[PDB]
Amino acid sequence: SELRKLFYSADAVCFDVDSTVIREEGIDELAKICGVEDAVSEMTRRAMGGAVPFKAALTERLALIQPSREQVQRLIAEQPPHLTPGIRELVSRLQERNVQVFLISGGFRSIVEHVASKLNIPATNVFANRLKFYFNGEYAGFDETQPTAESGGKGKVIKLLKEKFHFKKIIMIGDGATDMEACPPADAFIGFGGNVIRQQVKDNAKWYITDFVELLGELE
Ligand SMILES: [Ca+2]
Ligand SMILES: [Ca+2]
Secondary structure (H helix, E strand, C coil): CHHHHHHHCCCEEEEECECCCECCCHHHHHHHHHCCHHHHHHHHHHHCCCCCCHHHHHHHHHHHHCCCHHHHHHHHHHCCCCECCCHHHHHHHHHHCCCEEEEEEEEEHHHHHHHHHHCCCCHHHEEEECEEECCCCCEEEECCCCHHHCCCHHHHHHHHHHHHHCCCCEEEEECCHHHHCCCCCCCEEEEECCCCCCHHHHHHCCEEECCHHHHCCCCC
């Protein structure tokens, strides 16, 4: 109710992707497709929270994976991530109210833009890391000048959105400590535990939900 008043006052909503908009972690799914799920999956857990320098953790994880372009294509085509229940309807209600919706991820644009298309979110509204490939398709690194490539990158994205569009009320929605750490500069943060409860987030967030339906505030 009071959460509904908050949610309805936003003119922009930024969603974390991994474990919020989708059930999975995009990089762990890619690691599965490339055959090193075990090591990378725990490296990803080890980075969760404000725990390690993100950029180093991403280099090491990708150095084990070595994803080729055709492997990224196969992931998107054959093992696409699962949208969290309710998120399709939630983004639809937001877009019908002219709230600008963004996706922000430390994952990868190829995957996140696939997710955005399913949600009618334009690619201009997607902020993620960009994989590089050689002419033959072999993994060649990633763009380190992206804000999402560095620790604190979600906060840097939101700051860039404020400067570009002058939004008066930007809300960050996400499951982890780095999402909670994006407020400020976000105006409010709503923790999400529908896929996995991070107790550290749930204990310290003013707003926390476990089911995307809870923000649907008028049953239509
Ligand atoms: Ca997340
Ligand atoms: Ca911050």
